[PDB]
């Protein structure tokens with residue numbers, strides 16, 4: 001057939017000598033995320049990285065590595081390599097400011113409308129790129145966006161991502177309150193399903209990290225969404241911004257915005273931010289960031 005194109009991405013196997021852990025960034029059940037330095041040998045660079053490290057979840061994390069190795073975009077996190085020791089480690093560029101959900105909550109009293117709308121533009125760019133690569137994320141949320149610098153965010157966590165071919169996906173543990181109604185009812189996922197999750201993610205930012213449908217049981221979410229109910233208009237949002245959010249939550253997935261159009265609309269708004277958001281008061285020497293180490 002060759003109806004699809006060969007995925008000629010490179011999977012880099014990294015020696016364990018090549019990097020040094022430094023701090024435990026966080027622990028789950030799966031494993032731990034560390035921060036460290038990667039020094040490719042005889043390369044005279046030190047690269048700050050995150051390392052994420054045996055049942056059969058090895059096959060699960062290898063799926064994640066497959067996806068992360070195949071994307072290349074300023075607003076998407078790339079896999080640097082894997083290390084195949086006793087444990088399987090994913091190595092990625094360190095995003096020092098952490099996930100945008102925590103960032104928005106810790107700095108809510110110093111976040112201006114320029115930043116919020118710019119974040120919105122950047123996530124639509126990454127999401128539009130994933131759609132270009134025919135990739136459905138299936139878990140877009142503020143907790144899965146990382147902050148490289150306050151001016152530069154990137155989408156991560158591709159454990160649920162699925163690669164549509166040549167329009168929908170059918171699955172069989174899922175984030176209810178970020179899912180489109182069709183994803184709940186029929187377990188269908190589309191780039192337009194992601195546009196819904198994009199809308200919840202913008203709502204998270206505009207509320208400075210509130211929990212959507214806070215205090216509502218996830219099982220009631222389906223019937224509530226059918227009855228016509230959506231998330232409330234956040235205090236700082238003009239109707240212009242909230243009208244974009246509402247459009248992402250339309251029952252007809254095709255009459256929802258495209259990521260390419262969300263880019264345009266938020267760019268127009270980031271061009272005069274205070275018209276659209278009302279907010280009170282608007283160590284080593286050979287360190288190389290990963291975005292500058294291209295091989």
Ligand SMILES: COc1cc2ncnc(Nc3cc(Cl)c(F)cc3O)c2cc1O
Nearest residue numbers: 025050052090091092093094095096098
């Ligand atoms: C400073 O705090 C943090 C910084 C981080 N910088 C980059 N990546 C993170 N996580 C992560 C890593 C890999 Cl390899 C993956 F495959 C998926 C991932 O989500 C980070 C997590 C943090 O808590």
